Structure 1
Amino acid sequence: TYDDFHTIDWVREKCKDRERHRRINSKKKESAWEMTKSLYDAWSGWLVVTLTGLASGALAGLIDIAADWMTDLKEGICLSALWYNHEQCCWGKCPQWKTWAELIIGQAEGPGSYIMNYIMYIFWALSFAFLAVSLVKVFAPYACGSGIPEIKTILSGFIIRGYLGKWTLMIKTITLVLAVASGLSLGKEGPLVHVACCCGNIFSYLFPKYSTNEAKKREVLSAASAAGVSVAFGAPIGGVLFSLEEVSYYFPLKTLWRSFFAALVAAFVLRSINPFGNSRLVLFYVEYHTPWYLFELFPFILLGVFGGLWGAFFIRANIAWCRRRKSTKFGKYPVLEVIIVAAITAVIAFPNPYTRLNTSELIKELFTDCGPLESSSLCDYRAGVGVYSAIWQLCLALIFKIIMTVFTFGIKVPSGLFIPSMAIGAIAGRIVGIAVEQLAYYHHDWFIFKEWDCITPGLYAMVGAAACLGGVTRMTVSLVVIVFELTGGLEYTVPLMAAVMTSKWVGDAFGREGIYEAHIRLNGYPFLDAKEEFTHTTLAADVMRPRRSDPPLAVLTQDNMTVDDIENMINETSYNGFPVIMSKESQRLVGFALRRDLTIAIESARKVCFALKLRSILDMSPFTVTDHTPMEIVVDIFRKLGLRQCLVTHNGRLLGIITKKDILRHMA
């Protein structure tokens, strides 16, 4: 096994899995019942991903229901059935629903009612934020943040012991509902990836092939991330591609098939479980089957620019804020900071209706194209002063969400960035769509409008959402698939692709890192990035760190050592492994002895010749590299193979050692 905060050596896990397969095949021939058991062991992967999908579907549904209920609880309660949210009672004047101004002051409208509603909205936002931050701080500090930056590192081979446990799962679910209902600039769509990975890790223990294997566990977590995205956006294929591109790290075509199955199971559960018949794939779905004209692809591209100019700004601003908190008085007061952020968000969001709306419903509104019956300020046409006032409201919502999400992403409560960035993009896209429609029917004499309503601002809102989401995240295929799986509009894919590449390029013009890589670099997690390349001209001899300043390379001789000597080496040295060599002078790589395996073997024996025997645990095949090998090659070895150590050699004479951590330290 592995110690806390320690990396996973992928090759050793793969080898162990191979011996397990060999032993299972040996037991298989024993009896027909053993053949059935071997078949069950084979199905284990499908069963674990199936359970993960069912759990992710159930938990996403429960979180949606609870979050909607407690979000609407900020404006009032239902008298008929208290367990119904605003919409659930509207269709179930709206006499049933009663606001807090109605319950306390007794009069629905008037300055008194507005002030009472303002005060009660702020109070409930503070209460939900307080409960979320307090529960996270007390019972599970790992439940804060979206969590994707850390599952990226966990799928890279890193280990965070309690990160995907039961306590983190429970507290993240509860505190995510609370934070969503608190009115903070965040969403649960991102955090459902963490919740799905929690379910996957929890269910891995039910199976032996995945309980004791960290590589199989990583594969199950990749499938679980796919399921989490699938259930968050109703985007099975989009979730598969998100796990392909964002979170998971290796894909030997088996993780792809099992992510396919896990996303399928999650999507099927989400379809079967429709407690109130909400056909909307998620609360911010909007159907689309209208066509678009080539000229429209010009403004779409510009939306990408905004996204690239927002993402780029966000990664430059939020990452600068989170540093200050981490290195100032602010970082000493999690609860107080969440309280102040929630209070300010409530105070400055209650006035403007768009900011008052919970972000998912705001994105639903911005995506939905105007209908003749609708007369909301968003689709309020004579045009006249009303349209300009609506555009001004949308601009204010844009500015407010930008500023607040900058200050609100990293706070210590479950906080997503898919929905705030998506809403910023949708506000941008809707403003642009309204502007283009005004231009269209005011200047219809121009050839572009003369030859080809003519334009749907909902499509522009979709494209702006994709633009900002790709600018901040830097996701291309997963993001587009997620967007048209979310919205169902598989007729606007080319516009989405144009916006997403434009946003990614404009974002990369200011720095190639996304928000999930910048909250890995900022947190100093040990993540070896594939995008980054060892541009430095260096040799493996430099990076390897048995340096002249360092002590002698800790090693073990094959037969000279005694039990007491190796036990002393275990206790007095923190190293997790030792190169087992022929002799202190021969320095011939005989194998690699793991500190945990050595300790366990010695303890079991008490409760030395590597040729107390210790050949059972000896790693006869340690990966080696020439001392003159260029370092970039070693970086590629580590990245493609996912090794933990590579024992450099010099003309066959053991020269030292390199570890993933050594490369990561050097690359800083």
Structure 2
Amino acid sequence: GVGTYDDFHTIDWVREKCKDRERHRRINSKKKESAWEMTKSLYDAWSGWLVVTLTGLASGALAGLIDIAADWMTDLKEGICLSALWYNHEQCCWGSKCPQWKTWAELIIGQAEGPGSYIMNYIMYIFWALSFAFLAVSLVKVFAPYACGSGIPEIKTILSGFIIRGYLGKWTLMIKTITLVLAVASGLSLGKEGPLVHVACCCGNIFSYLFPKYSTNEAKKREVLSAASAAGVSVAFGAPIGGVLFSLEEVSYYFPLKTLWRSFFAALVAAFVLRSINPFGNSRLVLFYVEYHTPWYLFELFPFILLGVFGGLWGAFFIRANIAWCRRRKSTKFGKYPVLEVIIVAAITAVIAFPNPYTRLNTSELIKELFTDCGPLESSSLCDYRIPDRPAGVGVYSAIWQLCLALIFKIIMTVFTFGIKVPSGLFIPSMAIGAIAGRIVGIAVEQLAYYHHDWFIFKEWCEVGADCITPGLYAMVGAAACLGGVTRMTVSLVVIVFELTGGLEYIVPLMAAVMTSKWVGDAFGREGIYEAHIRLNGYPFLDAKEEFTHTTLAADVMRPRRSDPPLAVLTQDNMTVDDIENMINETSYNGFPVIMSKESQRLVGFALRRDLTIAIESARKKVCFAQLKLRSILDMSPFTVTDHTPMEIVVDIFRKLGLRQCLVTHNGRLLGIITKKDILRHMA
């Protein structure tokens, strides 16, 4: 019972490190006594690599299964495959105007064309969208309410030391997997790549419990989960180095500088296991995978910057509009009806996403077609073409018309769709918005070059007889621009994009676009979406970037004040059982310092609520703090800070040593306490 942590309170890292040292000393004392002890110590040391290996394996396997099921269910909204009911659209079409794959309209009316067929297909698409959204939201609400959302805002807080009991359990993992598949299939403007960080961390937490070295200790658990988040982003984007950089930058909070190898190994193993999931010989590393072998010119940095500007405004817009909506999702009756919320949102998305062929496609498929340049064989509306460039017809006009509506639709609907009670990600919708913007810009540039190639701006570069601009690169740049504008990631995101879409010729474009998007989004506030949502949920997250603007000291932030009762303290050897029982019943504090005497106020040590209560109960079933005696469980080395200490130092010691509370002493006389809640409240 002693040394546990209760629900929804932040962790003290120093105590966990001390307990880890105690266990290490216990092991090392026996280590040299016999060879068997050396073998046991080696196994205990390899426990970390075992848990990280299993986390990578599970992340790869679960991401592969999620991708397969999501693809199948997304295709199931548009038709079935009579020859084999367990093949998806692409697999059935490739397995040979196809008679084996039949849409619902052909099944019900028996006619493949006409107003009736379109009506029936529209209705049935709406039906499956509604059914998948219903099943996912209800399953989340009933069996594991923690699966909702991307879960990165919570994983970041958990790695910062926070505690959420079932967030990384087995029911949360199972329901997150199933409901993430169902939600991505439903057609909601959400993703499945951000939520895989939560799945990887769930796997890490589950696999930690197989080793007592990690089950009892918590900081070691945070290290394992930091590796797991790297594995999760790796498997999400297939970018081991990008995943590890994301973990170090966005998610991982505490970094002993040795687990970086563990994070990289976890990412590599996850990517390896995911790559092996290719039963049908797919040629893509990810469902939104594309590569580029075309040039880019210096004048294309003018609009690559412009896209960054877009990525900065939309990002800044999104955090403004989404957070506000999420606010209304809690300060209105809309929050009392989450299943109805998801039903309405999914229905609206399906009704307004079917007419436009770009929004009807799976967002990953949309990102894939937005990264692919127009080939000779392509005759779709996106590449309807009839001099260096190619003449264009009404098809391109209509294509821009449709892409504009797709962009508006997705910008508006991701705002309302991010914070609903079903596993939802933000990487995929943000990339879709950015890619649609980039494709629009690229098509505009291509048409501008074609009509006015005779202008000097293009006369120097564009060569007669060959294509001069590649809109797919513009789309890939806009994806990163918006992704960095919303997440405020700079280098981890750029590495993620580089590994996600192979090719180094576009480091300068991506770098410029991402930097411009972040700098434009910072002019409206330096909050990423995962920090704006951490703020909104009011999670006790000690931001590594937050600055204490007030030029005040630890004097300002102690919270015994003139309007508060006298500081809660403990005497040394005069108090009895009744006094402590009454004080704890009448008070609501997690820990109490121990001092010499009323007139002395000379510090002795620290004690915690849970262990003190446990000891009192044990003593009653079966009071001096000096050398009934509670000497053992008394934290005799509590951190202290002088009132004239400045708040930068207190924040720094909290960040580095992972403090949960620090006493404050004046000339050896105790004054008050400063906990994480105090620093966080006062920082705001």
Same fold (TM over 0.5): yes
Deviates more, 1:568-577 or 1:80-89: 568-577
SS of residue in 2 equivalent to 1:590:
strand
Q: CA separation of 1:355/1:559 partners in 2, compared to 1, >3 Å: closer, same or farther?
A: same
Q: Deviations over 1:184-207 (max 9, x none)?
A: 000111111111111111111111
Deviates more, 1:486-495 or 1:194-203: 486-495
Tell me the CA shift for residue 522 of structure 1.
1.2
Tell me the CA shift for residue 213 of structure 1.
1.4
Match of 1:411 among 395, 403, 420: 420
Identical columns (%): 100
Q: CA separation of 1:124/1:241 partners in 2, compared to 1, >3 Å: closer, same or farther?
A: same
Tell me the CA shift for residue 629 of structure 1.
2.1
Q: Deviations over 1:318-350 (max 9, x none)?
A: 111111121012111101111111111000010
Distance 1:134 1:146 in 2: 17
SS of residue in 1 equivalent to 2:664:
strand
Distance 1:273 1:31 in 2: 45
Deviates more, 1:223-232 or 1:606-615: 606-615
Match of 1:85 in 2: 88
Tell me the CA shift for residue 596 of structure 1.
1.9
Q: Deviations over 1:542-563 (max 9, x none)?
A: 2111222222222223333445
Distance 1:469 1:355 in 2: 19
Q: Deviations over 1:51-88 (max 9, x none)?
A: 11101111100100111111111001111111111001
Match of 2:532 among 496, 504, 518: 518
Deviates more, 1:74-83 or 1:604-613: 604-613
Distance 1:617 1:329 in 2: 47
Distance 1:275 1:558 in 2: 70
Does the aligned pair in 1 maintain the 2:291–2:503 contact within 8 Å? yes
Distance 1:133 1:491 in 2: 43
Match of 1:640 among 647, 656, 663: 656
Does the aligned pair in 1 maintain the 2:383–2:395 contact within 8 Å? no
Distance 1:589 1:198 in 2: 42
Match of 1:189 in 2: 193
Match of 2:390 in 1: none
SS of residue in 1 equivalent to 2:6:
coil
Tell me the CA shift for residue 456 of structure 1.
1.4
Does the aligned pair in 1 maintain the 2:290–2:371 contact within 8 Å? yes
Distance 1:94 1:12 in 2: 66
Tell me the CA shift for residue 565 of structure 1.
4.3
Distance 2:584 2:278 in 1: 57
Tell me the CA shift for residue 581 of structure 1.
2.0
Q: Deviations over 1:124-156 (max 9, x none)?
A: 111111111111111111111111111111111
Distance 1:263 1:33 in 2: 33
Q: Deviations over 1:429-458 (max 9, x none)?
A: 111111112222332233443333122111
Does the aligned pair in 1 maintain the 2:487–2:529 contact within 8 Å? yes
Q: Deviations over 1:242-287 (max 9, x none)?
A: 1111111121212322111110110111122222222311100001
Tell me the CA shift for residue 91 of structure 1.
1.0
Q: Deviations over 1:88-113 (max 9, x none)?
A: 11112122111110111111221110
Tell me the CA shift for residue 212 of structure 1.
1.3
Q: How does 1:310-459 map to 2 (within 5 A)?
A: 310-382=314-386, 384-452=393-461, 453-459=467-473
Match of 1:247 among 246, 251, 258: 251
Distance 2:503 2:280 in 1: 24
Distance 1:516 1:72 in 2: 31
Match of 1:597 among 598, 611, 617: 611
Distance 1:12 1:571 in 2: 26
Distance 1:111 1:235 in 2: 46
SS of residue in 2 equivalent to 1:551:
coil
SS of residue in 2 equivalent to 1:649:
strand
TM-score by length of 2: 0.95
Does the aligned pair in 1 maintain the 2:382–2:395 contact within 8 Å? no
SS of residue in 1 equivalent to 2:268:
helix
SS of residue in 2 equivalent to 1:666:
helix
Tell me the CA shift for residue 651 of structure 1.
0.9
Distance 1:490 1:37 in 2: 47
Q: Deviations over 1:488-508 (max 9, x none)?
A: 123211111100000000101
Tell me the CA shift for residue 597 of structure 1.
2.1
Q: Does 1:136 align with 2:140?
A: yes
Q: Does 1:145 align with 2:152?
A: no
Does the aligned pair in 1 maintain the 2:246–2:492 contact within 8 Å? yes
SS of residue in 1 equivalent to 2:329:
helix
Q: Deviations over 1:359-393 (max 9, x none)?
A: 000000000112111111112211x2111111111
Deviates more, 1:449-458 or 1:196-205: 449-458
Distance 2:468 2:618 in 1: 78
Q: Deviations over 1:581-601 (max 9, x none)?
A: 222332222221122222333
Does the aligned pair in 1 maintain the 2:226–2:252 contact within 8 Å? yes
Match of 2:600 in 1: 586
Tell me the CA shift for residue 472 of structure 1.
0.6
Match of 1:461 in 2: 475
Match of 2:632 among 606, 616, 636: 616
Q: CA separation of 1:26/1:561 partners in 2, compared to 1, >3 Å: closer, same or farther?
A: farther
Distance 1:608 1:30 in 2: 40
Distance 1:33 1:631 in 2: 50
Q: Deviations over 1:532-582 (max 9, x none)?
A: 211123232221112222222222233334455445544443322111222
Q: CA separation of 1:31/1:568 partners in 2, compared to 1, >3 Å: closer, same or farther?
A: farther
Q: Does 1:29 align with 2:32?
A: yes
SS of residue in 2 equivalent to 1:657:
strand
Q: Does 1:200 align with 2:214?
A: no
Distance 1:23 1:573 in 2: 38
Distance 1:600 1:41 in 2: 30
Does the aligned pair in 1 maintain the 2:434–2:475 contact within 8 Å? yes
Does the aligned pair in 1 maintain the 2:438–2:477 contact within 8 Å? yes
Distance 1:296 1:411 in 2: 39
Match of 2:464 in 1: none
Distance 1:110 1:217 in 2: 60
Deviates more, 1:54-63 or 1:292-301: 292-301
Tell me the CA shift for residue 604 of structure 1.
4.1
Distance 2:623 2:58 in 1: 49
SS of residue in 2 equivalent to 1:557:
coil
Deviates more, 1:186-195 or 1:627-636: 627-636
Tell me the CA shift for residue 605 of structure 1.
4.5
Distance 2:47 2:609 in 1: 31
Q: Deviations over 1:388-415 (max 9, x none)?
A: 1111111110010011111111111111
Q: CA separation of 1:167/1:565 partners in 2, compared to 1, >3 Å: closer, same or farther?
A: same
Aligned residues: 667
Distance 1:220 1:143 in 2: 20
Distance 2:177 2:583 in 1: 44
Deviates more, 1:318-327 or 1:552-561: 552-561
Q: How does 1:159-198 map to 2 (within 5 A)?
A: 159-198=163-202
Match of 2:113 in 1: 109
Give the CA RMSD over aligned residues. 1.5
Distance 2:504 2:99 in 1: 40
Q: Deviations over 1:280-320 (max 9, x none)?
A: 11100001233322222221111100000100111111111
Deviates more, 1:472-481 or 1:452-461: 452-461
Distance 2:575 2:559 in 1: 24
Match of 2:19 in 1: 16
SS of residue in 1 equivalent to 2:607:
strand
Show structure 2 runs of 5+ residues with no match.
387-392, 462-466
SS of residue in 2 equivalent to 1:646:
strand
SS of residue in 2 equivalent to 1:365:
helix
Distance 1:574 1:256 in 2: 40
Distance 2:103 2:259 in 1: 50
Tell me the CA shift for residue 616 of structure 1.
2.6
Distance 1:667 1:103 in 2: 63
